[PDB]
Amino acid sequence: MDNRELWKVLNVDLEKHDEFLAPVPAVYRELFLNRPNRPRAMAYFDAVVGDIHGIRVHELYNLKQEGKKVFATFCVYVPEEIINATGSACIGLCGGAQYTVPAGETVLPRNLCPLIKSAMGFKIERICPYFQVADYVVGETTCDGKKKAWEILNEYIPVYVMELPQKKEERDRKFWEEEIKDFAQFVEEKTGVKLNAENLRAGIEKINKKRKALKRLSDLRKHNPAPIHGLDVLLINQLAFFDDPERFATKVNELCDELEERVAKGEGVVSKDAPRILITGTPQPIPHWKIHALIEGAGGVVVGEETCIGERYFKDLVEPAADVEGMLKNIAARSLKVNCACFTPNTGRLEDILSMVQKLQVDGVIHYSLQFCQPYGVESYLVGRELERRNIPFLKLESDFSEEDQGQLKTRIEAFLEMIK
């Protein structure tokens, strides 16, 4: 093939790479392709999944040859606009694979979040071309696991760490603006492009246009019957981390046009009696589609996702400004409006949940979080207690990237859907 020599040049272990890529087509066929009632604008995304380690890696390399850089992030708090204002890429390989768990566990204790260990293994075994072509990695201080794993990752690839505060009063708002300014200076130093009003406003328009299409897609999901299955929207939000901000937004808008066509005639992918489910908790990387597949494989339909591969990524858009200082202020202020479970207290995400259930008309919420995720694990008590106080059905789930939790999670989901008919 052609990607063969690109992987070889990028220093990719080809034996492990093939052993990892082996079972993906059958899973993607059973979970995605074989399902009927599918929209027509999704084939594009299928093609992307059919070559996720191919075309986009070529694009990243060929644009790296132009004098640009490739920045890799793990947190949506990192300003995508500031990076894309210099003509450089901003990708986010949050890996959700078990194949790379025993690898990343060689340096991390086994009682850690599966995402961190999966990404660490992806890097240690040289098996992810996105991780190879990436020049830098931008970390932050959200959980103890990632904050400490940066100290190990920096020996493998350079790591720049932003410091995010833990509360959101006046001084915290101020401190984050200074942090964004330091990151912008670092970006100017590393890319060699001075930030003007032209390029910065251009990048802000670019990222806001990317987020607007996803928020339109999310707003289209609150109709009855459901015009699209939740697994497809999940895959869309998942692909939103490696794709070009223009073509992705265009295809998302075309899919939204098709879904509006469906809504105009009352077409739906599920029977109208089916339960509608809302998901809240930790983001689900790719390919970690287990929960959506199990929920929609018993008759239910997911209408919303309150994760950072859900609505928390595209909910807030940047406000315009005049000079560069105002643009940086607005970027930092947009970033700090994310009601992540690392702040204390975090009473805004609860308002988010209670408003999303009324918007999407949800019959029951499910609080799925990863195993050994303490920030989202502890807050679940308060979230569920408050939701039960207000007479809302609630289910707490927890699993890892293992593939064969079918029986237990299946019984849980089926009992829930039987109860909240």
Next chain:
Amino acid sequence: DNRELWKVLNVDLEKHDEFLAPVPAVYRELFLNRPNRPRAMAYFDAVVGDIHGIRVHELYNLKQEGKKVFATFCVYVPEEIINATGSACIGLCGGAQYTVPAGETVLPRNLCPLIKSAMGFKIERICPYFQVADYVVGETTCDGKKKAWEILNEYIPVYVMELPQKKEERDRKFWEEEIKDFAQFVEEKTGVKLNAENLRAGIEKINKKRKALKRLSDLRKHNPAPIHGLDVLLINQLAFFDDPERFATKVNELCDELEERVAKGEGVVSKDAPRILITGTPQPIPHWKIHALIEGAGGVVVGEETCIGERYFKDLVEPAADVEGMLKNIAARSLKVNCACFTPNTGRLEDILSMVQKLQVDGVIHYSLQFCQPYGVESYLVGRELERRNIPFLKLESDFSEEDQGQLKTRIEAFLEMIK
């Protein structure tokens, strides 16, 4: 009068007695019958003989006299300011497993045993040192305690200080302003406003205490060892519950006895037993399992790089002329702690190596609690850098369960069997 106090403070006396039932035998086996113990140790034993009594009487008397009792869970708390504003300050980290399942009703099972034990002790209402507390001072360190303060607020009230994540200039100013906020807090809640001459009094008292503990810790650099490590662990544990003045005096008299023990050349064990440095997470009372397993097999522990240890008495406040300068100095002193919640943290590695050099240690053990992420992940870099310097290393980790020693003993002996 003890049961009178426990009735005043709402104690489910049944669970209280069932918790205190199998404790005197443990303390007799681990301490009382162990030979060659010094004489000045007697006082400390008396404290454990009345662990829920006379000190609770003193705290409740201070309460009835119109003054507060501040409960803490960290080292960064400016206890100097609390001592300045008259009120008392006590630390009470989680200790036993009896309260773990109860605490597991509001917290996940995959959390640290310390937070679970603390939450259980609070909910079960069987701790006089907790049932007498007026406030709690939490911090923003780990994920567990940060997200558990919210659930704790529904019970006894909680004030939270925000600790930064690095030690640069912005973090220094941030911590300075947070110390100012906590000073305003104690000014308002204790009624007393602080001036220079009264703030320096608490500064000097807490200094005296820390430097007395520092003298005792330095005294352990003699071969053969003058004192066993379990007694020093008990001293550092009781340093959070006792009264500072008399405790400093008692530790000074113990140091006076150890001076003669060093001059005569008498040791608690032979000059062949291995010297072990413990480093990692703190060991609250009664978590004497690790030291007991290390020494009972035939070793000695001459150093504890924990916060119930070297990191509670290494740094002391610098002097200043005015109140603002004294507050800035208290903040700068508290920020000198090299915990595993900042990034990077090479200072702790420098401390470990310097203690290995000074204390003549021939065996290093890194012990952290179960489900502890900060130290549990930093252990990799710590061991990797220590292995280069050709230092024997051993990673250990467990919870508050009793009969897990079967896996620990086999892990301990072998270590001591090869570092001869």
